[PDB]
Amino acid sequence: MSRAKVGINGFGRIGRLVLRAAFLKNTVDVVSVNDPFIDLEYMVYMIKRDSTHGTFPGEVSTENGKLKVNGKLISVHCERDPANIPWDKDGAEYVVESTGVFTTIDKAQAHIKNNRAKKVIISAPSADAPMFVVGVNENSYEKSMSVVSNASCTTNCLAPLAKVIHDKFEIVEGLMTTVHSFTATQKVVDGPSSKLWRDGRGAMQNIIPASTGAAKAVGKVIPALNGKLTGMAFRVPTPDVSVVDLTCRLGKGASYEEIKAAVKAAASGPLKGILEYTEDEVVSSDFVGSTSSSIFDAKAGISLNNNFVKLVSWYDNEFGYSCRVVDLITHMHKVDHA
Amino acid sequence: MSRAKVGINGFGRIGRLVLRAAFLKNTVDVVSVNDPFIDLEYMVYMIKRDSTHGTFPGEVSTENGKLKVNGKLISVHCERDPANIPWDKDGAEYVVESTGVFTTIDKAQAHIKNNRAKKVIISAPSADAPMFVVGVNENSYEKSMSVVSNASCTTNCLAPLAKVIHDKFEIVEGLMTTVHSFTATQKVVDGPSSKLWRDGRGAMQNIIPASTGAAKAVGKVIPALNGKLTGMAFRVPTPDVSVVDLTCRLGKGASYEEIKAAVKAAASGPLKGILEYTEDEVVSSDFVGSTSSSIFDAKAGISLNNNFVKLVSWYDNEFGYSCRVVDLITHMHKVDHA
Amino acid sequence: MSRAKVGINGFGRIGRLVLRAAFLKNTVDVVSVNDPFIDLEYMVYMIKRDSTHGTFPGEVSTENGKLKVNGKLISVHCERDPANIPWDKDGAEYVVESTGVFTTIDKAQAHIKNNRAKKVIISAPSADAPMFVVGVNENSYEKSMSVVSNASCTTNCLAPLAKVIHDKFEIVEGLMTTVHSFTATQKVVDGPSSKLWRDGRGAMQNIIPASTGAAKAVGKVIPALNGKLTGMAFRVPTPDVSVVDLTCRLGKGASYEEIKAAVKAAASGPLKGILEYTEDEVVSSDFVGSTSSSIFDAKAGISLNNNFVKLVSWYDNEFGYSCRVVDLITHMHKVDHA
Amino acid sequence: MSRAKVGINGFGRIGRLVLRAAFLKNTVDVVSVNDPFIDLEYMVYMIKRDSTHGTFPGEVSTENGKLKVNGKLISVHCERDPANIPWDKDGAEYVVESTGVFTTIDKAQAHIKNNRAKKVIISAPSADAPMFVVGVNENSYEKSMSVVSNASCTTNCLAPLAKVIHDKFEIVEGLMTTVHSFTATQKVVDGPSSKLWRDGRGAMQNIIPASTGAAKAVGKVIPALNGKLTGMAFRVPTPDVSVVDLTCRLGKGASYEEIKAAVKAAASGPLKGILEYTEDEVVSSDFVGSTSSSIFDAKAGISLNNNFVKLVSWYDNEFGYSCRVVDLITHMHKVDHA
The missing domain is CATH 3.30.360.10 (Dihydrodipicolinate Reductase; domain 2)
Structure with a gap:
């Protein structure tokens, strides 16, 4: 029981494939997605179809304004501003900053304020945010850190x-x-x-x-x-x-x-x-x-x-890295909520 | 007598090649170029190096602040507002509209306003501007037309x-x-x-x-x-x-x-x-x-x-179409500046 | 009430993908393969890894000089003369010609010479052999036709x-x-x-x-x-x-x-x-x-x-056509053994 | 005075751009080509058309069963056996072995056999034949060396x-x-x-x-x-x-x-x-x-x-290597002749 609730901001290449990895590994539960440059109906398309990784091997549709994926409803948002997304109401604890535009602890703190989401995970190397690699220093994660980084895929x-x-x-x-x-x-x-x-x-x-x-x-x-x-x-x-x-x-x-x-x-x-x-x-x-x-x-x-x-x-x-993002969450959740 | 003096806005793909097409036919004169995103430094590079058509046959350099191309100097601007591009100063009587944004006559007329661009030449289909295809509806063009289009390459x-x-x-x-x-x-x-x-x-x-x-x-x-x-x-x-x-x-x-x-x-x-x-x-x-x-x-x-x-x-x-942009001006200048 | 015993000649990209279709559909039993350029070890590689259709979905290995796929044993041969392939000893009743070298009826009778294979399906369109397309004239197949093609994939x-x-x-x-x-x-x-x-x-x-x-x-x-x-x-x-x-x-x-x-x-x-x-x-x-x-x-x-x-x-x-090849054979097995 | 008379065996990819670089630099004179798979008519199309380097810069036609390029004549042969090629009748002193089949001093001597070719150059590296890289050890060429190599592109x-x-x-x-x-x-x-x-x-x-x-x-x-x-x-x-x-x-x-x-x-x-x-x-x-x-x-x-x-x-x-082949030849004809 007690799985980590996850949200995604930035439905790009390295943001949709992270979503795939979630329903595969089944180590966490995605509950929220936000992208102002992508329509909701479009989102189903980009998930179901992929020129690199093929079609999604599950069930993807729409329940009443919510994206149902392999029998799981997820709320969708489209705020230009990242601090205008209500993660709390979706129940998301950890947000994945995959837009790659808020790579600093100051910018990514826009997800955390007004008590919304606890830890923010940047899918790119950060200058101020402590970067982590699941192979080496995944254990260096201290609980007092909010905005982390999973480094680059290279x-x-x-x-x-x-x-x-x-x-x-x-x-x-x-x-x-x-x-x-x-x-x-x-x-x-x-x-x-x-x-x-x-x-x-x-x-x-x-x-x-x-x-x-x-x-x-x-x-x-x-x-x-x-x-x-x-x-x-x-x-x-x-x-x-x-x-x-x-x-x-x-x-x-x-x-x-x-x-x-x-x-x-x-x-x-x-x-x-x-x-x-x-x-x-x-x-x-x-x-x-x-x-x-x-x-x-x-x-x-x-x-x-x-x-x-x-x-x-x-x-x-694209996909190896996506999985290491899913891993870093599991570890944190294992560490913060235990 | 003279060759038509030409200016270019939007140094895109179908715009840099129009330029490349002018020094080949040598039927007209490019005097000014405008693109806010691409600076003078960059303009030289974009012109000189091309992955498709190869290195530019000639010496592309800068001089005294303006661009030079085999002994001919081209004024350069970076205005995002077409109305504020100074074609009148540069001496540009003919303007090629290759941004994709401006298509309406009343839209492409921000180049014409206030004592500058004589005729506006949209290098794209226009659903109001009289489209013309050289060799077909070439001579069908009238001197009473402030904005024309060359339609698509296809x-x-x-x-x-x-x-x-x-x-x-x-x-x-x-x-x-x-x-x-x-x-x-x-x-x-x-x-x-x-x-x-x-x-x-x-x-x-x-x-x-x-x-x-x-x-x-x-x-x-x-x-x-x-x-x-x-x-x-x-x-x-x-x-x-x-x-x-x-x-x-x-x-x-x-x-x-x-x-x-x-x-x-x-x-x-x-x-x-x-x-x-x-x-x-x-x-x-x-x-x-x-x-x-x-x-x-x-x-x-x-x-x-x-x-x-x-x-x-x-x-x-890319290049075949950019030629018909050039030829059209030789026709206009024939008819439209004489 | 029986299954077709299939052999493959020509281990190119149709030959291999026809095999994949056989284990995907499980309506026929591949029993032999022949390609004088591809040995037992290499066949495994070409079956395992595939740039276009990804890795083989199942079990492939070798055993006692025979290729082994999903528990079924497959004899391997390197005969360049199709009349030298022991289809009889291999129990192959249907032979897939995909070398392109034999498209005519008489050049296809090699697999049938001296009581061996019963039928031969030509993956390449033929000039004399009766061409058929599954979904158009499957039921036009007579039981007496020794050579028969499957048209092209186009x-x-x-x-x-x-x-x-x-x-x-x-x-x-x-x-x-x-x-x-x-x-x-x-x-x-x-x-x-x-x-x-x-x-x-x-x-x-x-x-x-x-x-x-x-x-x-x-x-x-x-x-x-x-x-x-x-x-x-x-x-x-x-x-x-x-x-x-x-x-x-x-x-x-x-x-x-x-x-x-x-x-x-x-x-x-x-x-x-x-x-x-x-x-x-x-x-x-x-x-x-x-x-x-x-x-x-x-x-x-x-x-x-x-x-x-x-x-x-x-x-x-590639694959769609390979599927039709299989469908044709299992259909042939229906008629001959009706 | 005298310019290097050159023949080419194997009008493949590399042997075809050598010909190209020859007429470009005009420092040697190609007089003979051989390739059993490519006839005269085809040979012209392979010159006039190149997907990578574009069309050849010159007039290429056929005068009396002979390939004419820029006014220079080249006799063609389809001899599969290099020892049957009349390099003597063609007057080819320096032959370019552009097929990978003859890359040893024993295997390359078929050109030199029976008093015709007097030097042979392997477009590929060789085991026993002395290799050379122009600019590095082209001066280590000795008048006695009958067969050489230009190493590889890399x-x-x-x-x-x-x-x-x-x-x-x-x-x-x-x-x-x-x-x-x-x-x-x-x-x-x-x-x-x-x-x-x-x-x-x-x-x-x-x-x-x-x-x-x-x-x-x-x-x-x-x-x-x-x-x-x-x-x-x-x-x-x-x-x-x-x-x-x-x-x-x-x-x-x-x-x-x-x-x-x-x-x-x-x-x-x-x-x-x-x-x-x-x-x-x-x-x-x-x-x-x-x-x-x-x-x-x-x-x-x-x-x-x-x-x-x-x-x-x-x-x-492709072409940087072919230019060096022409330089290797020009250097020898110097040293060879003194």
Whole structure:
């Protein structure tokens, strides 16, 4: 009994797929959704239909102004302002800030005031809000914190992998590269982008050397690896799934077969679920729907020697991350209401 | 005597290429450009680097605060209010309206007001402004018209074909389908499009059924075929170039051999440069950068009997259409500034 | 009261997806496969992981030199000469020819030579073998026919619809187009295509116009439409699913809504499972893994008048067809063992 | 005086752009082509039409069963057996082996057999044949060397950069990843690929881990870094232009500015034409048609510290390589003739 009641503000890509993960894992209960740029009737469409993840494997309709999903009514809102959503009346405790526009404790506090929702969870790396990665520092969550962060989805891939290698071979220093699928933030043709010019170029016809602090933010998830990690991104013409290309220096001399054994041991043990291990000839479509945060590709990895190796790990940047959002809630609820 | 002095508002896709089309024909003069979102710095980049048509053939730079393009200086503005764009100062007598917002004559007249833009040229269909398709209703244009429209890119492909077939076999009735490359109006991944839900889907993994106002608009350019034409569109994962698929009944008998030689005589004849004829094994990429408005494909056209055929005409939806913007001005300036 | 014993020749994308359909429907028992390019280990890989239809839904492994799927054992062979495949020892009574090398009756008699397979179904449209379409002329199968084809997948889409529209309102004539996905017969980059130059172009870069008799082949399954139907094909950068574009002149006039009503009933009638009817804002990726032969889109298709209408219908060119292959065999098992 | 007379075996993708780059640079003279699968008529269409690089810039016709290009004549052959090709009658001194079937000194000598061809160049890396990268070790060519290799596209990118680095700051140890466009060896959809399973997968649906022997191969070109550097590749859905992602440890402490200057100086100096330096916010498609082997991207490269950095260099994996083949030939005809 006593499941966590959850609400969502920002029904984007990384906000609808989080909703999918909820009815799958069944670890929490969604009760509310708010998005002013999306109509209610539209919402059923975007849930039922998805070009990446297929149609919803349940029942979706409308009960009397409420979105019924797999036999569960959810109230819908559409306030331009985030502090104009009455979470209390829906019974929501934890709000998911997936609009990605209120990524600060000051802005996200707009959900918490007037006693409405207790904790706010930002589905992006935050500057002031304490970021968390379910693999590593999910336990660092103290009850006195309201607005958290689940870091970036590249971070959710690298950080768990970094922990294993570092804790077992000691990562002296490393540089990361993520071959990232394109995201909502890109253009179908050479369009406007007054800030990030490269990010405006046609998404299908370009390899776009983007940037990311995800690897640099691994330091915030793993403090022992602070300033020892950073890296950039390549955004390539694929709808979903991404891979991390880590190259680093280990403290202990270890052969690749040794590395494999440790990772295989982690993905089976304490990281059963966050980290996964395979030795198959996979590509970036064998992971569409993977709940894991990192899938170590043993085969594609290469070792120059025993102190300098290149590692590769996949992740569903959309759905793996979505699941880790659902996990962070369960943990909190487990921690605040117990 | 002189060349027409031209200005451009809305440095979009179908706007930057119109510019690129001016330094090629060199039939007119671009003097001013206006776009609030895209600064001068950015304008150079957007012009110089293009994922579809390649790097600009020439030296694009800045000088003394204004934009320069192979020894010609272009004044630059960032006014969000068309009424406050100073065309009068710049010397812009002709303005191309490529923002998508302004379509009404009384709307496009915010450019004309108060001693600046002589004629307003809307690079999009207008349901009140007299639409005109060069090569068809070209000379049908009157000097007493303050705002005109060039209609859609697609309709600029069908009409020059429609005319030929009509003016020789008389098109009884016909339905058109255009397999269209995606446009800036779409989403790279499943996104918000409250009006047109299907154009909210991932443009790169989907064949998206649309509906265009290009086919009946041929009735607006060719009155004889008014109401005899209509048809919808298909958006597919290519960055540029589209093809018209015209299915129609004829009034007179036709051997497809005749229709061929009819088009060939119209391509090299009066419609030289507007309508083109080909027999080659062409594919969409074979028309990137093409200046033709319609390129009839001989072998790809199918014919059921002597009266009911299916024609096929290619076009660069971006660059072919941007040329007819330029040519129209040479016609106006002929008629409208003399 | 028995089940068909099925063998597969040609382990391409139809061959594998036919197998998936067999375990999804569980109406036939696949007992053998043959592909001189694909060994036992690889087959597992190709069955397990699939870029388009995701991972195999069930159990696949190997055992005692035999492929094992969901508990059923499947012999594996690598014969390049079809007359060298031991269909008798394998107990395969029905052989699926999907190599394309054997489409004629006599080139198909290899599997039947010297008491072996009883029947052979050609997944490719044939020149002499009796072509059929499930939902149109299933019951036209005689027990004496050794070779028999299942038309094309393009053919299997338009055929059910025609037996509705023409069956009710009569299309005096009609032309067809199919915006097809790309198939394994194509090239990643510009390459060789000796006899059909257009097909050897960048499949991801291009819209490729290709001829197809799959619309002329309608006359074979519906004699009444012999010479009344024919069409072409466009191939676009999408991995799977295609749409049929039918522009036909109807004898008995009907409004765009009257015809919708006709197709409704057909979806819930005897073709319940063949012809489907939808009214949703659908795009191509919605019908991935769909078992229908033809899904009519009421929102897409439009009508010029009452006698001249355009219809749009979707189909999974890979999986939908594979489903019909299965349905045909289990039907054949009914007759031979009646 | 005399210009290099060249023949091409295998008019595939790479052998077809070599011809292109030849007439572009006009530094050598192509006199003979051979490809059994491509006849004269087809050969012309493959030149006039390119999905990636557009139409060829020149008059290409056929004079008397012979291919005429820009006024230069080229005799064609469809000899499957390279030892049957009359390179002597054609007067081809330097032959380009562009089919991967003849990549050893014994297997390549069929061109030189019986006094015709006097030098042969392998468009792919070779086992025993000495490889060369123009700008790095083209001066190690000896008049005695009858058969050579130009390594691979990727090697020609990594090497000019590595030379600069290792010479200025010394690369202690290094690892490389190349985000590479797909090539003719891949499939449009999941197809057979017995030796390399991942490459069987649909080229345009997946990110595909592959292996390149182009990083250790630098070791054969620069022994100083043999065993000290290696790497792999990710295959992504793009038609052309790849990028190299080089992570390495510098023996000398170097700041990023200090690195930026290191490359800018060599791109203007002796590596002018080979290595290029840029600071613009570019993407892959900005390099289609680039005649450079390596284009250093400053804004995309990063530095963890003064001794651990990540460098990025673009390259047209199709046409940058073909230009170097022409330079390898021009260099030999010099040395060969003296």
